[PDB]
Each structure stands twice: as structure tokens, then as C-alpha cells.
Amino acid sequence: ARVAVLISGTGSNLQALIDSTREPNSSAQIDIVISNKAAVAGLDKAERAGIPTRVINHKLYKNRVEFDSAIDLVLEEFSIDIVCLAGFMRILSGPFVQKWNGKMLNIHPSLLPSFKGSNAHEQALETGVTVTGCTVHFVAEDVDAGQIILQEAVPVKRGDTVATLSERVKLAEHKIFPAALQLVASGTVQLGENGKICWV
Ligand SMILES: Nc1nc2sc(CCCCc3csc(C(=O)N[C@@H](CCC(=O)O)C(=O)O)c3F)cc2c(=O)[nH]1
Numbered sequence: 001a002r003v004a005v006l007i008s009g010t011g012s013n014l015q016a017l018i019d020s021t022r023e024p025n026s027s028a029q030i031d032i033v034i035s036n037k038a039a040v041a042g043l044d045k046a047e048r049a050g051i052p053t054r055v056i057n058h059k060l061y062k063n064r065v066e067f068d069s070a071i072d073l074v075l076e077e078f079s080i081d082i083v084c085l086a087g088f089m090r091i092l093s094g095p096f097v098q099k100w101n102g103k104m105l106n107i108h109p110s111l112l113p114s115f116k117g118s119n120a121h122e123q124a125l126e127t128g129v130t131v132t133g134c135t136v137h138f139v140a141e142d143v144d145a146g147q148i149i150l151q152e153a154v155p156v157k158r159g160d161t162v163a164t165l166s167e168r169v170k171l172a173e174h175k176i177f178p179a180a181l182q183l184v185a186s187g188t189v190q191l192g193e194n195g196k197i198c199w200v
């Protein structure tokens with residue numbers, strides 16, 4: 001399965017994905033890394049790994065739809081089969097999501113449905129939970145609302161801050177996001193006709 005990773009920043013999930021997909025049993029190959037922000041560290045990791053990179057500036061297109069069109073163009077250019085959002089901080093248009101329905105995974109740093117949205121760790125700490133975690137899910141139109149693929153619980157420790165909580169969660173992310181990719185790329189998991197998660 002040919003895979004694209006969309007990033008916006010440091011790219012440590014990208015790195016975890018690269019690491020698993022070079023294992024010989026990997027059913028995924030990362031063929032392109034696409035970032036909407038230049039000079040971010042995820043682009044270095046991708047170039048250090050030998051993976052082609054493209055930077056699409058969302059300040060050169062008029063529409064969200066024109067912008068995703070540019071991404072889709074690159075995905076088609078590289079004959080991509082699966083799209084992994086690994087720290088992509090931009091919301092995708094409805095038609096783009098429709099076209100990739102069932103082929104696009106996202107890593108979100110909470111136990112969904114808790115703490116949808118962009119500041120999940122802040123939500124978790126404000127709420128006062130003693131357990132949080134991360135989720136890999138298919139991207140549906142409603143944000144952080146697609147079919148869940150994997151989750152891993154992570155403890156919240158006393159005095160945690162966003163810094164320390166997200167450090168702990170990210171170790172879990174580097175576990176379940178490569179596993180989730182591998183489930184989907186091997187055809188073990190798909191999105192069923194009924195749109196629920198389909199094990200095979
Ligand atoms: N349809 C759909 N799309 C998507 S994308 C995704 C990955 C995580 C999204 C995190 C996220 C939560 S809010 C937000 C935001 O407001 N971004 C600004 C750009 C901000 C900037 O660049 O400064 C903007 O999109 O304009 C995000 F980026 C999941 C997902 C999904 O489930 N459904």
C-alpha cells in the first residue's frame with residue numbers, strides 16, 4: 001500500500017511511521033511526505049529518510065477546496081493508497097474527505113470521543129481526568145468523529161502539563177499509529193459497507 005503522510009510540524013509520528021514501514025513485514029510504504037508549513041522538522045526527517053517531500057502553502061490558494069485539490073493532485077501523482085495525517089494542523093474539505101473516505105487515518109491525542117478538537121491535552125488537564133490516551137481513526141467529515149481504529153490509554157500524572165502529558169501520550173502514538181497503518185494497509189481492517197470498522 002502506497003502511503004502519504006501529511007505533517008505540520010516536528011514529525012515524530014512521521015518518524016515512528018517511517019521506522020515501522022521499513023521493517024520487512026511492513027505492508028505500507030511511505031512514498032511522499034506533504035507539509036503545509038515550510039522549515040518544519042518533519043520535512044527534515046522525511047528527507048533524511050529518503051522520502052520525497054512537497055510543501056503546499058495554504059496562503060497561495062483561495063479556497064480550502066483549491067488547497068485540498070493541490071494535495072489530491074500530489075496524492076494522485078504518487079499513486080497513493082492510504083493517507084496518514086500525522087500532526088497535520090489543517091481541516092480538510094468535505095469533498096476531499098469524501099474522495100479518501102476509508103483511506104485516510106488521523107492520530108488524535110485523546111481517547112475519543114473525549115476532547116475532540118485541537119487543544120486536547122489542555123482539555124484533559126482542565127477536566128481533571130486520571131486517564132487519557134490517543135486514538136487512530138478514519139477521517140470522516142465531522143472532525144475527530146470517524147471510525148476508531150486503535151486507542152491506547154495513558155495515565156495523567158499529578159502536576160502534568162501539556163508538555164509532560166503530550167510527551168507521555170506521544171509514546172503511545174508512536175505505537176498505535178504504525179500498528180493502525182499496518183492493519184489498514186494489510187487489508188485486516190477496512191471501513192465496511194455500513195461504515196463501521198470492519199475486521200477481516
Ligand atoms: N474534515 C476533517 N478534517 C480533518 S483534519 C484532521 C487532522 C487533525 C486536525 C486538527 C485540528 C483541529 S482544529 C484545526 C484548525 O482549525 N486548523 C486551521 C489551521 C490552523 C493554522 O494553520 O494555524 C484550519 O484548518 O484552517 C485543526 F487543524 C482531522 C480531520 C477530520 O477528522 N475531519
Ligand SMILES: NCC(=O)N[C@@H]1O[C@H](COP(=O)([O-])[O-])[C@@H](O)[C@H]1O
Binds near residue numbers: 009118120166170
Ligand atoms: N488535533 C490534532 C493534534 O493535536 N495532533 C497531535 O499533534 C502531534 C504531532 O506531533 P508530531 O509532529 O511530533 O507527530 C501529535 O501529538 C498528535 O496527537
